[PDB]
């Protein structure tokens, strides 16, 4: 619905990325108050990282736009996808997502 | 940092899942204001899904709330060569997924 959170002269938008998009990096089209812009997501990006799109905030002074990464998942994988997910789980076995607890 | 957000008589906690855990499903140990519980995460789980854990909310001699494990997908650090090759194959296998469908 409304796409932007207003924080002072800045704008923030939730940027949904497929997990492979965050891991590999990707070039994504992101909407602004006027026209869309191509944003380069760096490889290895994390949930919640703020990608700054300088100059695309409120043109009061001219603020920035921040695309805040949220990782989104496709639906239940089919068998081919599961096998790959299992390999990746094995590949990244050292990763502890609940290191806090 | 404090783990539980209070909402009326219910508690809410961020449940961090690696993407393979959300896709494949998993059984996770979740903390409570007392004893940790065992929670089943279904395969195909989605970001922001609210998984209920009855009775683990705020206890009062009148009413006991629930605890909700809210899913947040988290990523490891930048991948090595093999992991990168697996991410590519996953991307190709799930090429149909459009996370930015909305836009």
CA distance A22 to A85: 16
Q: Which two tokens stand for residue A21?
A: 């998009």
Task: Give A52 to chain B, closest Cα distance, Å.
Answer: 18
CA distance B37 to B27: 10
Residues in chain B whose Cβ is within 8 Å of chain A: 1, 3, 16-24, 28-29, 31, 43-47, 72-79, 82-84, 86-91, 93-94, 96-97, 99-100, 102-103
Given a contact cutoff of 8 angstroms between Cβ atoms, the answer to whether B93 and A39 are in contact is: no
* Resolution value (Å, 1 decimal): 2.3
Domains of chain B: 1-76 (2.60.260.20)
**Method by which the coordinates were obtained:** X-ray
| Residue among B3, B94, B100 minimizing CB distance to A74 | B94
CA distance A30 to A53: 10
Give the distance from CA A13 to its chain's centroid. 10
Q: Which two tokens stand for residue A69?
A: 């990464």
| Residue among A46, A71, A92 minimizing CB distance to B83 | A92
User: What's chain B's length in residues?
Assistant: 103
Query: What is the SS3 assignment for A91?
Result: helix
**Concatenated DSSP letters of chain B:** ----EEETTEEEEEEEE-HHHHHH-EEEEE--SSS-EEEEE-TT--TT-EEEETT-S-B-SS-B--EEEEEEE---SS--HHHHHHHHHHHHHTTT--TT---
């Amino acid at each position: 619905h409304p796409l932007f959170d207003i924080v002072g002269h800045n704008l923030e938008i939730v940027l949904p990325l497929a997990p492979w998009e965050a891991a590999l990096g990707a070039k994504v089209t992101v909407p602004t108050l006027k026209e869309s812009i191509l944003l380069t997501v760096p490889p290895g990006s994390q949930a919640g990282q703020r990608l700054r799109i300088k100059g695309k905030g409120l043109v009061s002074h001219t603020g920035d736009l921040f695309a805040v990464i949220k990782i989104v998942m496709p639906t239940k994988p089919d068998e081919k996808a599961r096998e790959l997910w299992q390999q990746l789980a094995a590949a990244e076995a050292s990763f502890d997502p609940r290191k806090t607890w």
